[PDB]
Design a protein around this motif. Structure first.
Motif, PDB file in Angstrom:
ATOM      1  N   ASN A 192       0.887  -1.144   0.000  1.00 13.21           N
ATOM      2  CA  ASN A 192       0.000   0.000   0.000  1.00 13.21           C
ATOM      3  C   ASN A 192       0.927   1.195   0.000  1.00 13.21           C
ATOM      4  O   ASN A 192       1.378   1.635   1.056  1.00 13.21           O
ATOM      5  CB  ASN A 192      -0.821  -0.005   1.280  1.00 13.21           C
ATOM      6  CG  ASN A 192      -1.733   1.188   1.381  1.00 13.21           C
ATOM      7  OD1 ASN A 192      -1.613   2.146   0.599  1.00 13.21           O
ATOM      8  ND2 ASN A 192      -2.656   1.147   2.348  1.00 13.21           N
TER       9      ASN A 192
ATOM     10  N   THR B 138     -10.831   8.869   3.287  1.00 10.96           N
ATOM     11  CA  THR B 138      -9.626   8.247   2.741  1.00 10.96           C
ATOM     12  C   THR B 138      -8.517   9.280   2.703  1.00 10.96           C
ATOM     13  O   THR B 138      -8.649  10.320   2.062  1.00 10.96           O
ATOM     14  CB  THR B 138      -9.840   7.760   1.291  1.00 10.96           C
ATOM     15  OG1 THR B 138     -10.976   6.893   1.241  1.00 10.96           O
ATOM     16  CG2 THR B 138      -8.607   7.008   0.784  1.00 10.96           C
TER      17      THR B 138
ATOM     18  N   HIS C  57      -9.226  -1.021  -1.061  1.00  3.32           N
ATOM     19  CA  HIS C  57      -9.042   0.076  -2.000  1.00  3.32           C
ATOM     20  C   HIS C  57     -10.013  -0.052  -3.156  1.00  3.32           C
ATOM     21  O   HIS C  57     -10.266  -1.150  -3.638  1.00  3.32           O
ATOM     22  CB  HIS C  57      -7.614   0.077  -2.552  1.00  3.32           C
ATOM     23  CG  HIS C  57      -6.558   0.018  -1.499  1.00  3.32           C
ATOM     24  ND1 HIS C  57      -6.078  -1.170  -0.988  1.00  3.32           N
ATOM     25  CD2 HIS C  57      -5.909   1.003  -0.832  1.00  3.32           C
ATOM     26  CE1 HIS C  57      -5.181  -0.916  -0.051  1.00  3.32           C
ATOM     27  NE2 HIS C  57      -5.064   0.396   0.062  1.00  3.32           N
TER      28      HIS C  57
END
Lengths: 144, 140, 144, 145
Positions: C6, C98, D55
């Motif tokens: 990530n 986010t 995601h």
């Protein structure tokens, strides 16, 4: 997947001037050198030691052109390319040279301060306009 | 702005066994070799061509010990390192070697490997499986 | 295997000054807003166009400290962090946030040089981005 | 400079099948979900902890078609895209979603595999000798027949 990923991200300064070489047949090609530094205070009776890495970066096409006209020693650049090791004989001894190549997937952006100019930094490859405003053509893709 | 960024990100397969070497101080080092490749079709030069780059990647400490016991010829792996060009003298004259160094803020991760697994489900594998019928085999 | 990767890499400038805050429970925290843009020629009309993205970056500890004492509006920065989507109820409505988090493995770096205080570019703010507003926003901090 | 860099690199597993969908104007589009995780060797009452991120990735062009035909839930992939926050609204109050957009400069590669894959452990080999055509272009100590 035998392919894999080969990526190099660099942000540094050209320790020297850009060496550009045009090739009226295959295109221009610029070779620059970027240094990256690491500072740590330690070892014997010394105040912070330094160690810089020099990187051979080769630009192709319009990137090498953009470079040539706007890049000079001291310039700060962001580079995204891939590693390339090439062999050659210096005379009788076999040698290998590793460099960072900036192909079509990679790129380069001038940092320091201030942006570029008219639609840049860029590099003709993928894009376009294909304005759809005539007497028809509502079918086929708008292109771009 | 005078320190820049030096980051190498690689995903590829080892082309050899993790050659581990301890150096008089404790920590060990593993000199691994990774391969990445590109396949070009075209015809002007033939039919289907392919270039495969061989990366010299070095590990230190725990990651070296990890690599030795888990990584093998063929193991696919993810790496984050920095570029180092070092000087050595075989037949004098000086030889320069560019290697991918994975040190502190760098990293290596095993794909489809790592073994041991990931702890366990805080609601399963207590002794058999899940309710209804039996221990639901379909776990993937 | 299971963890995965990530990673986010960003290069851009602050759209405002840093928003820090200290709290004996993990040190400091800093909130930054970065903009990344794409030059857009657009000749179909003759005049240029744009489209900037705003990224919410959260720095912790030293980097949070550093950000406050050095980073200022317009400053160009390089960010390496990861994505974190956090949930929260804004008083009945459940929302998600986010953002780009810079943890130990991550990093931040200023792309300018030895400039006093922070560094505010006397350039300006070109139009063509931020296709929305931002007055009286939700969020759920309140503290320190 | 104004531009800047908007790059996201991901390596994870699909949480479900590639929800692909075409459309008149825009070519092929495909929404997928990706997970990544991180666990600390700490301890509270016994074991450690887990915190996976999901995601939202968006694929366009041939990529979205490939995802549909060959990508499966659980498949491990490598992604390279840019972050895009899109505003919208299905009810009211406006909603803002942040996603990983995969396009042009972006890329997606299928991971997975197996192991070593010995040359000829027990399968048989046939197709020309070994001496003729070894190593690089030049000769150098090597059997040539």
């Amino acid at each position: 997947a035998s392919r894999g990923v080969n990526k190099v991200i660099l942000v540094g300064n050209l320790g020297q001037d850009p060496e550009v070489r045009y090739m009226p047949n295959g295109g221009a090609v610029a070779n620059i050198t970027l240094a990256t530094s690491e500072s740590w205070r330690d070892k014997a009776t010394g105040e912070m030691k330094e160690q810089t890495e020099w990187h051979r970066v080769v630009l192709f096409g319009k990137l090498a052109e953009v470079a040539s006209e706007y890049l000079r020693k001291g310039s700060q650049v962001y580079i995204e390319g891939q590693l390339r090791t090439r062999k050659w004989t210096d005379q009788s001894g076999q040698d290998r040279y590793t460099t960072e190549v900036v192909v079509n997937v990679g790129g380069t952006m001038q940092m320091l301060g201030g942006r570029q100019g008219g639609g840049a930094p860029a590099g003709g490859n993928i894009g376009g306009g294909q304005p759809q405003g005539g007497w028809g053509q509502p079918q086929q893709p708008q292109g771009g």
